[PDB]
Design a binder for this molecule. Structure first.
Ligand SMILES: CC(=O)N[C@@H]1[C@@H](O)[C@H](O)[C@@H](CO)N[C@H]1CO
Ligand SMILES: [Ca+2]
Length: 885
């Protein structure tokens, strides 16, 4: 218990001018370290291993500070040993924390809240303990394997060079898929065969074997899985969706096929995934979830998938060759929930640093994916390189020429190397691009010909450079390292411009994803320039939820585009998240297997029967109401489902929760409520279908979101009219409506914030408390404030990824509205004017709470009766009966 007064040093990753880290341990209460960015922690080295008894912390003023304290005795694992989360003000006496004789050579103090400022500080920190005489071990540097040295390389080349081995692998893997999807007991009821393409097109066949088994042919694994899916949907009344609800009840005996079926697709590619999907949905996926997704992809005909798994190791090896240590690379790379905007060159650093063990684990996961994709015949889209470098690249490489890219939503964009330079100047685009493509091959090997990169995504700066020449040189460099390369390019709000695209000198080795074809198609300019392009349904923005789909456009515009074009080489999905409206994604991929328009109404009728395992006239009537309301074709511009007012920052005249969203309901709300009445009437009969319960919760929460918007307008009028008694009553029903909404959301495991957070905290094995807390920060921030203040507010990202989720609704959305309502009520009751609320401060307080110290959110759904909840909603919180209420 003696104060450690010699040999103590400290580091920090950021500080305001003159308030450096060493000022936290200089014995002077008048000097302080102060943070300058989102790295709000300091790391103290004790000059040896001590058994700590006390830690004492002083701040620079008398604000309320909250912080978490971590310790490490091996140099790698920092585990939580103390914290302050109460609302006590700091004072001249400091805060003393008792430590239970914990061994520690290093200490981390993370100050997550300063009630007075966005920036945090530590005036002094004193550590008390007993010297053990020991010193920390030297921590091993990051060590990763080359692909060619792993068993993955042996297996990948064996598949490549041995057709008999490759066919045995594929056919066995499709059999394993069957066991995973419907059960191992059904594996031996199928016989799978590889056949040739049908006149250059992927094709599958389904027929009777002759002895009661199902014979399925296909030119590759995807076609085989698609034929297996076709048999389930059309003969077993079965529907598979591992993310959004399934019906896997198989008949007691295998239904006979009857007449043989041969079905092909005219599309070379069926594409899946936005960069954003890797953040809003897949951030914390394990291999079990990736395997499910690839099974579902193959069954839906998907053969081209964006793949950024383990790209952090590729970039580490690359930047290591240009003066960057591993620690500097970790500061450049974002956290695990922000890779989408890191690789689209929009932001750096935030959410990190990643743990040291991240790099090898993710490279291994990526190799695991490529093995499975090779078995199925799914092409991954790896990374191209367009010149992205950190902002200090010139400091370490003096001859390099770079272009400042400015800001994106308050984040500092990375720099961009000049794609070409004058003669006499060093060309670091050529240097770094050569290293990048070579390092990518070292990590994963030759797994694809498709590479994605998107300079100037949603901003940037072309500097003095010529637009077309930029894309000419980027493509040529890509082809230099892979002669068969195809540059996969996003087409998003008119970018890249025609002048940029016309710089592509090899049109057949570029492929443009028309990102938003079902709302704002933009492929005519691509078709006119003879550029291969893909028709994509985006549908989902930020994971924001609500009933929303364009089935009629999918059933008609896709074959119409094929008939009116020559360079349409596929269809696909580009959702920012895969969590809502499974009908839309089922119908899209189904449109790959036809050249004619289909009837979206009769398609929906067949879809709901296999999704629920049964149907009747009333259930069909309810879904026709959905088709006539929430799923009805529209011709305006909109990003995602209409947002729930419950999820918006409280205020006057709200028209959306997110900056680029919308809350206008374009259908009649009371008409849509009829669908809920029908579902409730049929609840007892259909409650054995999990997909029915999924859909029931989906439309019931849409009902309460729609009615909450009306109740919000009424209490807004009551305030403007000075009617305090009416405001108290209407706002009381509004808050009660939200309480009912939280109960509805609690019935679905998909809607639990606890599952999102726990996945983040457990996505790596043998991680320390520090990494778990940081990953939880990633998970909490992304669905609320997104970034910190300058990103949420000035940057416009506040509640961009708002979710109608259990736990989050009770503790975040409800709390905001309750606070706002209480303020307005006090004013109407003859009090002082309602104060301004710093919403970000309140929101960031929830963001920084930890599951092991504050509140652990459940991972188990409730048993609430959706039919009974629907009755309450219709009787007490509905639009139809609103005047009686
Ligand atoms: C903050 C954010 O996620 N913004 C997304 C962006 O990341 C995405 O690349 C783009 C195309 O899907 N849509 C933007 C939203 O209009
Ligand atoms: Ca000091």
């Amino acid at each position: 218990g003696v104060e450690i007064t010699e040999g103590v040093t400290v580091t920090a990753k950021g500080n305001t001018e003159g308030n450096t880290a060493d000022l936290a341990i200089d014995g002077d209460l008048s000097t302080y370290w102060e943070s300058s960015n989102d790295y709000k922690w300091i790391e103290v080295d004790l000059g040896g291993i001590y058994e700590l008894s006390k830690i004492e912390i002083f701040n620079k003023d008398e604000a309320v500070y909250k912080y978490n304290i971590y310790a490490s005795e091996d140099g790698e694992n920092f585990n939580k040993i103390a914290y302050k989360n109460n609302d006590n003000v700091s004072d001249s006496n400091g805060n003393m924390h008792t430590i239970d004789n914990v061994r520690a050579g290093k200490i981390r103090i993370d100050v997550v809240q300063n009630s007075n400022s966005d920036r945090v500080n530590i005036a002094e920190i004193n550590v008390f303990g007993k010297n053990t005489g020991e010193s920390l071990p030297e921590v091993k540097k990051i060590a990763t394997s080359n692909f060619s040295e792993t068993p993955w390389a042996t297996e990948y080349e064996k598949f490549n060079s041995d057709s008999a081995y490759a066919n045995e692998k594929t056919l066995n893997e499709i059999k394993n898929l069957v066991g995973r999807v419907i059960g191992r007991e059904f594996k031996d009821k199928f016989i799978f065969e590889i056949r040739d393409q049908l006149n250059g097109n992927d094709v599958f066949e389904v027929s009777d074997s002759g002895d009661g088994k199902v014979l399925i042919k296909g030119n590759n694994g995807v076609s085989l899985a698609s034929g297996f899916n076709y048999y389930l949907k059309n003969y077993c009344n079965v529907s598979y969706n591992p993310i959004m609800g399934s019906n896997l009840k198989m008949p007691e005996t295998m239904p006979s096929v009857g007449e043989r079926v041969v079905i092909d697709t005219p599309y070379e590619h069926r594409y899946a995934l936005n960069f954003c999907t890797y953040s809003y949905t897949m951030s914390f996926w394990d291999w079990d979830q990736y395997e499910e997704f690839l099974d579902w992809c193959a069954m839906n005909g998907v053969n081209l998938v964006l793949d950024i798994i383990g790209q952090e190791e590729v970039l580490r090896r690359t930047l290591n060759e240009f003066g960057y240590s591993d620690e500097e690379v970790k500061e450049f790379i974002s956290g695990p929930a922000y890779f989408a905007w890191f690789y689209m060159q929009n932001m750096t650093g935030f959410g990190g640093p990643l743990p040291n063990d991240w790099f090898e684990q993710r490279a291994e996961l990526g190799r695991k994916m490529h093995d499975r994709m090779q078995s199925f015949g799914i092409n991954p889209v790896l990374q191209g390189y367009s010149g992205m470098v950190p902002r200090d690249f010139k400091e370490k490489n003096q001859e390099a020429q770079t272009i400042s890219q400015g800001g994106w939503c308050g984040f500092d964009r990375p720099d961009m190397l000049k794609t070409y330079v004058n003669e006499g100047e060093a060309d670091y685009f050529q240097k770094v691009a050569d290293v990048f493509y070579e390092k990518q091959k070292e990590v994963f090997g030759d797994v694809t010909n498709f590479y994605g990169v998107d300079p100037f995504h949603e901003g940037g700066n072309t500097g003095d450079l010529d637009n077309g020449k930029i894309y000419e040189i980027i493509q040529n460099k890509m082809i230099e390292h892979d002669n068969d390369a195809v540059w996969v390019i996003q087409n998003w709000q008119g970018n890249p411009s025609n002048n940029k695209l016309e710089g592509l000198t090899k049109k057949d080795q570029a492929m443009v994803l028309d990102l938003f074809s079902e709302v704002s198609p933009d492929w005519n300019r691509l078709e006119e320039r003879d550029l291969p392009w893909i028709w994509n349904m985006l549908h989902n923005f930020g994971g924001r939820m609500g009933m929303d789909a364009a089935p009629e456009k999918l059933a008609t515009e896709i074959p119409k585009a094929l008939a009116n074009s020559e360079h349409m080489v596929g269809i696909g999905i580009t959702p920012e998240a895969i969590n809502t409206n499974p009908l839309a994604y089922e119908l899209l991929f189904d449109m790959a297997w036809t050249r004619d328009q289909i009837n979206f109404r009769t398609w929906t009728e067949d879809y709901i029967e296999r999704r629920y395992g049964k149907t009747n006239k009333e259930i069909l009537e309810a879904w026709n109401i959905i088709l006539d309301t929430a799923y009805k074709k529209r011709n305006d511009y909109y990003q995602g489902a209409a947002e729930s007012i419950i999820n918006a920052r409280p205020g006057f005249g709200i028209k959306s929760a997110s900056t680029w969203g919308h809350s206008k309901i374009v259908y009649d709300k009371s008409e849509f409520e009829k669908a809920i009445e029908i579902f409730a009437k049929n609840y007892d009969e259909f409650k054995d279908s999990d997909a029915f319960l999924y859909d029931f919760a989906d439309i019931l929460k849409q009902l309460l979101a729609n009615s909450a918007q009306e109740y919000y307008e009424v209490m807004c009028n009551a305030y403007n009219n000075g009617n305090g008694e009416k405001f108290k009553f209407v706002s009381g029903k509004f808050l009660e409506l939200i309480k009912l909404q939280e109960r509805v959301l609690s019935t679905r495991p998909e809607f639990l914030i606890g599952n999102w957070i726990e996945d983040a905290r457990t996505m790596l094995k043998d991680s320390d408390d520090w990494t778990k807390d940081l990953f939880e920060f990633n998970a909490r921030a992304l669905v609320t404030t997104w970034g910190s203040r300058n990103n949420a507010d000035g940057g416009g990202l506040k509640d961009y990824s708002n979710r109608q989720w259990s736990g989050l609704t009770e503790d975040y959305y409800y709390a905001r509205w309750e606070k706002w309502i209480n303020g307005l009520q006090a004013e109407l009751d003859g009090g002082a004017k309602a104060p301004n609320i710093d919403w970000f401060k309140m929101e960031y307080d929830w963001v920084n709470k930890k599951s092991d110290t504050d509140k652990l959110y459940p991972t188990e759904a409730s048993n609430e009766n959706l039919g009974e909840l629907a009755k309450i909603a219709m009787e007490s919180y509905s639009v139809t009966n609103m005047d009686k209420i």
